[model samples]
Target chain A: SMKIDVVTIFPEYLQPVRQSLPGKAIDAGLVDVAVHDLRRWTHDVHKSVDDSPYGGGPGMVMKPTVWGDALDEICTSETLLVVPTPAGYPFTQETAWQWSTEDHLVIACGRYEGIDQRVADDAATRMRVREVSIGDYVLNGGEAAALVIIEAVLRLVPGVLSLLEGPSYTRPPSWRGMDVPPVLLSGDHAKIAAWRAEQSRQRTIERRPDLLGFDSP
Target chain B: SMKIDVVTIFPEYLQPVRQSLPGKAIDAGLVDVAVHDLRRWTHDVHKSVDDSPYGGGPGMVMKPTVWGDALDEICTSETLLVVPTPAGYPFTQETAWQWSTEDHLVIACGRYEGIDQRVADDAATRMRVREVSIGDYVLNGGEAAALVIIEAVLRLVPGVLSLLEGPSYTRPPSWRGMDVPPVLLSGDHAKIAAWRAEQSRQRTIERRPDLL
Candidate 1:
């Protein structure tokens, strides 16, 4: 079974994680999901998890102490640490597919400026670490990105969904004066496949041409 | 104040929405967030929101009727419509910055195959409509993507983050064999600012050269 853990100051932010397909997978016994609060690991009475940066800057950097304590308590040699940050590689479907095979996936939610770089560096000593960016833009924290991640990864797990992949269109073949393409109605499977393939490519080009150069495997 | 609305079958999918920076913003009255249930618009006893595709397809497509009904109740003529779909244009910080100024923003969460394209077309006649994709990937629904949009937009609101955009580092001039760049420690504001700009560019280049 695949296990996903989210460590964040706002554990409640991951509440929706248990209500969708990812939640259903957990209920089906196909996967296990957990959310741990970073504050729980803090030793101070204030439960503070961040401090000013070593270098002069704006946002607060997540202190390494809380991160160290939390990581030490939650991570293991088998853990695949997923850290979402602005300065990271783009998260892709292929990588999402690869992560589904791991036994335990630990998602550390970095807030404020971000986690201390050393936490990731130190964690690299014993576990697999992946610093991925959901997109080019920035978010307040990694929790939302984790939601995007869990859904993408869990749905690809075996027996999760019936269909592999396809862009679906429904009846009234012609709607708003637009026809559902004559080829889809033609009984020829070859032409239908060609039509669908072309549709995906053209649609992708129109929507995200930047990805075209890399869409090929 | 900027107002945000979310219409979805899984209202709880936005649970985490109220907990982080987004939550603090709400607490501080920076913005107002409202989540509506698509089920609310369904007249049926079972609240059926989806029906099979037209020609033939595997998954269900959210019916235009429910979306139409839902939008009727939630949208105003001035509402800025944000729809997330794989078939949409890329979502960027630039667009996000623009949205922070909107008086009323409504986000329609597309599940299954997504809402009928006709709904978006129809909505455009009455209000502004935009179909945006958070990234070059897919998720089970727009709920998760909504979180990303909310965080990006909400943080840019005046007085939201208190500390706008900049790289941050903490105590100990040195740690774990890594030292805070000497320029940042030089106490020369001009040099520190220059160092940050150069560092930001280098980081962006090394990590996301595709953006260049």
Candidate 2:
């Protein structure tokens, strides 16, 4: 079974991971998922996980010691530590495909400004450490990024084939005068397959032209 | 006031939206947020919202009638309907900034293969419709993407600024032999600012070269 451990200050933020397909996989015994609170390893009155950035900044930075203690306890030699941040490398389908083969993953969900660089730098000596970004946009925290990355990787695992590969249509062929693209109802498997492939290509061309070989600016 | 409506099969998946920064905005009354069960509009006994894809795919497609009924009732002329799909336009920081200014947004989170295309086509005639993709990877459904998009847009709203712009450090001067870069402790404001900018630039170079 693929093992995923998510450590975050907002542990409840990841509760959604337990209600979707990832939850389904967890129940089906294909994967083992656990959510941990970073504060569990803290040693302070507030059980603080973040502090003011070393260099002056408007936001706080997650303390290295806290993340260090947490990672030291959670990670094994074979684990790949995923740190989600806007400054991280772009995480793509190919990356998710590769990560699905790993024995274990421990995603450290950072907030505020981000986790100290030292945390990732030190962790690399013992295990794989990857700082990845879900997209070009920023978010409230890595909790959402962790959910996206976890969902992406877990879906690649065997028995969890889920994708909205293209546009689709169902029942009541004529609704509001919009017919179900006659080809889909044509009943000729060959023509239907060709039409579906073409529709997928056209839709991709219109929206994501980069997917088909052209470069995106 | 910005009005945001989310329609999804797994309504519980969007519950976290009520806990994070978005929830804070909702509680503050800065924006009105509503989570709807798509099946609420279904008439079938099974409350069926999905059916076999018309093109005979292995996965099912969200029925058009259900989404049609849901959108018709939820969207106004000012509403911008967002459909999260693998085939949609890239949802970026710029797009989030643009959407934050919208008066109303009704995000229809699709599952399985996706919602019937006619729903988007028909709705476009009445209001704006944009199908957005979170990133290159595929998700179980639009719920996670919805959370990402909503968070991205809401964070840009006037009072909800939140971003993890760069790497940061804190309290412990040293930890396990790792020292907080000496410049931060130099006590010179100019040097500290320059050093932080340099560190931010370097980190972006190493991890996200495209950002530079």
Candidate 3:
């Protein structure tokens, strides 16, 4: 089973991740997941894991030391380290499928301003470092993004879902006036495969054209 | 004080909302929040709140009937009903500020594909209906978006936070990497007002040009 670890300030916020769908994956032994409190590594009475950015800025940046220690203890060569930020690469089904292949994953959920840049740079050496964004908008923290990533990635893991008489998964051509290619329902395997490839391209172009140049595995 | 009623499949997921930052607003009595399990209103043994979409789809679409009843029982004249969806209008600081003025809010957190469209359309008549998108991406469900809205809006409510000297509330610009504007720290009241307006517009434009 793949193992996923989350490091965050408010560990309680991850309760849903442990109790809902991701929790189901854990229960079924499809995955093993743990949530660690970043405060455990804090050195101050105030439990400060953040500090002002080196250059003048508005919000506090998470300390590099705290994140570095957490990564050194948890990450491995098989680990996929993901950091969710508004400026990161957009998370997609393709990325989820890629992540499902990893044996371990370490997700850092940043709050306040953002995590220290050094933490991200350091983690890149040991494992795949992906900066992901759910969408174009801002969130109070990365916990929501972590949940999104977990749900998407876990579903792609083999044996995590039961397949009924037919193909195990389905995708829409469109919703509420949005349309997917008509070829998907044609039932021709080759044509359907071709349609799906084009659909993926078109959908990304129409909704998030910025991702057109993204390197995918 | 404003009241918010959340209709969710997993009531346990709502626990963090009551225990974290949003809980601070609840404790101050600045907002009254309630969590309602949609399954409780279901009659079937499976307590299913979703089904296959009429046309066909990968994920289940939330049933309209369950949401209808929950909304009917919770809505008031001044209520604003919000649905967190990837297709919805992007959530913004201005939207949070606007929602903070409402007397009541009802949030429907859909799972699977999403709630049946009819449920959102029907509820629109009794209350202001809005589809709020937290970001440009998709989530497994709407619970996190609801929490984000609650925390952002709740802090804007008067008397919810206790300030030491002037305002007890933490401004977003000051805390994020963005600066609080030199005028804000200049101690000049007139210049501070102008600076704040300009900074708010500038920041909004840079991060979310779509707001324009």
Candidate 4:
């Protein structure tokens, strides 16, 4: 079982991950998951984990003091630290696939502006640190992005998606006057497989054309 | 205020969203959000909203009739229907900005294999329908994607992030050896802002060169 840990100042905001598929995986013992409060590593009475940016900015940036200490305890040689931010590389399926193979998966959620860059730099001295973004847009913080990553990766952990991770239409092929393609109804297994693949790709072309030639980062 | 509504078969899966920022916006009356069960529009005793694919495949596709019925009862002419799917337009900040301007946002979370493609096509008949993907990964369902979309858009609302949403630092800039740039302490607002903008862009180039 792989262990997935999320460290965030807003632990209260992580409830979705606890109740989502990752939580179910934890209950089944297929994955070991833990949510740590960043303040635990702080010695200050106020337990401040963020501060104003060195350059003037509206939002506060998280401090490395707490983040550095947090990583010392949570990560080891094999752990992968995932930091979600606008400045990070695009987080995609291939990225999820790679991390799903790790023994200890530490997702670092940066709030306010973002974490001090040195924190990730410091962690790179030991474990692997991956900075990622969900999309071009920003979120309230990384807690939600961590939830998105955990769910996408967990369902692919072998036996988890025993059946299928895709779409299929049922009995009334002619429902609401929309008919399923005749090839799917022709009942030839080889042709049916070809049809599903073609339909899937065609759909991708129409909706996400970038996927056709996308290079995983 | 934008009205946000979610139609999902697995309504129970939406718990975490209510505790997130959008939920806070809903409570603050800045935006109104409602979650409706897809089963509510079903007439069958079993309340089945999905059917097996025509080509022998795994999982189910939501029936168009059920989807059509739900939208008829919920969507207004001004509502923009946001259907979360991989086979949809790339969901981005620009997309969020577009939807944030709408008076009503009806986010439809598709489960199973997906909703009948016709549901989206027909939805286009009544209201503005935009099919969007949060990113490149597939999920157990679209509830999480909807949560992601909601959080991204809420902060765009005028009063939402007036407190804090960007990178910032406070006093005692030197922490364990890392020092805050001297320009910030120099108190030149113009230079400080200029330096921040450059750093932000440089950071973006390093982290997301694709943006360049």
Candidate 5:
């Protein structure tokens, strides 16, 4: 079973991970997952993990020392450190597919302006460190991105969302002034597969043409 | 105040929105947010919201009827329907900026194979519908995407993450073999801002040139 660790200040924010498909994987023993509070490694009484940027800025930047200690304890030679950041490279399905093959993963969830630059700089020497952005937009913090990343990667790890296959209808042939396509109702498997594949293709072309030619990240 | 509603099978998955910056906005009355259970609209006793795909597929597809009813209750002519799907158009900062100006948003969170295609098709005639994907990856469901979309949009509404002004430090001059840059300590606001801007540009060019 692959091992995964998530480090964040708001551990409760990640509780959904344990209740979703990834949680199912954990219970079935297909994967090992743990959520750690960043403050556990702090030395100060206030457990402060962030501070103002060296250069004047609007928001706080997470302390590098706090992150450095957290990573030092969780990462190893085979570990892959994933830092969720808007300033990082895009996190695509290609990245998920590759990371799904990793033996161990440690995701550092950052808040405020983001983590100190030195944390990633130093972690890169011990193991593979990927500073990935979930999308073009920013979120409250990395907790949401971590959940998205975990769900995307774990579903491909042999025993999760990979089970199912796409516009589905049940029982009723027609309802609400909308009818299931006649092709789907046809008992012929070949026709149904062809129609489903075509629907997927047309949807892709119309909604996301870049995905068709997108080689890699 | 902007009104936002999220319809999902796993309402608990969205609890974070109430605990984050979006929650503060809700309290300050800058925005209004609600999480609704999708199963509430189901007519069946089991409250089944999904069924096998019309085409023989490996997974179930969310029933269009369930979503149809949910939207009917929440959406108005003024509402914009946002559906999160991997096959949908990309959700970018530009999209967030546009949506931040909306008066009302109803995010339909889907699971399994996704909501029956008809849901979006029907909603289009009455209101604007956008099938948005957070990124190039897929999730177990749309709950996570909805949380992300909510956070992205709400932070722009009025009094949220917008208050800040960006690499930030607090006190110590140096620690853990790293030293705060000299410019930050120089105490010149103009020079400090100049250095910070250049650092941002250089960092962007180095790590995320696409953002540059």
Candidate 6:
């Protein structure tokens, strides 16, 4: 079973995670998920985890010391450390599939402006550090993005959603009113496989052309 | 002050909005933010707000009857009904500014596949119905997107920010890593005004060229 530890300030916000789609994965014993409050590592009297930017900025950036201590406790070589931010690499189905294969996952959700840069640098040295973005827009915190990734990735794990038998299990032929090629809907397995590959390529090109240059397919 | 109502099944999920930046607006009396539980309007053995899609699909679509009643009660002539979904118009700073001027705003946060199309259409005729998207990606619900809009728009309302001496308050003179044209910091009010307009255009063009 895969294990995921989420480091966040608002641990209560993750209650839905334990009760929603991700909860089903836990019930099936496919994944073990825990939410850890970053405040537990705070040294301040008020349990402050954020401070004004060193160079000056509109909002406060999260403190590095608290983040560092939390990361040190959970991070391992097999763990994938994901930080959700608008500036990070775009989260995709391919990325979710890759993370699902990992034995351990640690997600750091930053609020306010963002987390200290040093946290990212430190996590990169030991565990696989990834800065993931749901999209170009900003959210109040990373809890929402973390849930988004967990649900999408958990579906790909063996035994999770394995009982579902239908065309919906496969990616939508077309999305957002766009139709997938007619060949994919046809029941011919070989032709359908060929058509899906083309559809993925065409979809990527039309939606996020920037991903085309990456080494991975 | 403007009144904005959010209808959702999980009201606790929206606690962050009341405690975060948007809370400041409510405290200052610049906005009235209210969250309603759709389940409150349901009368059944199971307070189910979703059913199978009409034609059949991967996920269930929200029921129109529930949303219709919710909208009728919350929406007014001055209200702008915003539906946050991947298929909607992209949320932008300009749209935030436009919403800031409204007397009331009601956001419908759809879960599962989406809300029934008929519910959205009915709300459209009585008020300004905007199908807004926070970004290209999909989310579990629209509450987060609604929070984003409330915070961004509330900040733009006059007198919301007490200490209005920052670049974020001013026409956003590029600072930090974002370099503004020299004329903005030149202290020449006339040139500074022109420089801000140019910078706003350039920043919008460079970052979100789709707005062009």
TM-score of each: 0.87, 0.93, 0.70, 0.86, 0.88, 0.67
Among all windows of 10 consecutive residues in model 2 chain B, the one with the lowest summed lDDT is: B159-168
DockQ of each candidate, alpha-carbon based? 0.46, 0.69, 0.12, 0.48, 0.51, 0.09
| Local lDDT at B35 for model 6 | 90
lDDT accuracy of residue B41 in candidate 1 = 90
Regions of candidate 5 where Cα sits further than 4 Å from its true position:
A161-171, A188-190, A213-217, B21-24, B160-212
Report how far residue B16 has shifted in candidate 3, in Å: 0.9
Model 4 achieves a DockQ score of 0.48
Q: What is candidate 2's lDDT per residue for A168-210, written digit by digit as tens?
A: 7888889999888888888899998877777777877777766
Q: Residue A26 CA error for candidate 5 (Å)?
A: 1.9
Q: Evaluated with TM-score, which candidate comes out highest?
A: 2
By lDDT, is 4 or 5 better?
Answer: 5
Error of 4 at A172 (Å): 2.0
Give a tens-digit lDDT track for model 4, residues B1-212.
77789998767656555655444556677777678989999979999888777777566788888888999999988889998886667788888787777788888998778888777776787789988888877787888888888888877887643011224455556755666678878979898777777777777666655556
TM-score of chain A of 4: 0.85
Which is superior by TM-score, 2 or 3? 2
Give the top-scoring candidate (DockQ): 2
Model 3 CA deviation exceeding 4 Å by range: A43-46, A161-217, B22-24, B44-46, B51-59, B92-94, B135-138, B151-212
For candidate 2, give the lDDT of residue B9. 88
lDDT of 2 by residue, B1-212 (tens): 68889999889998878555455666687887789999899988999988888868698888988999999899999999999987888999999999999999999998888898899999999899998889988888999999998899988887664223555678788877888878888889997877667767777777766555
lDDT of each: 0.80, 0.85, 0.70, 0.77, 0.82, 0.68
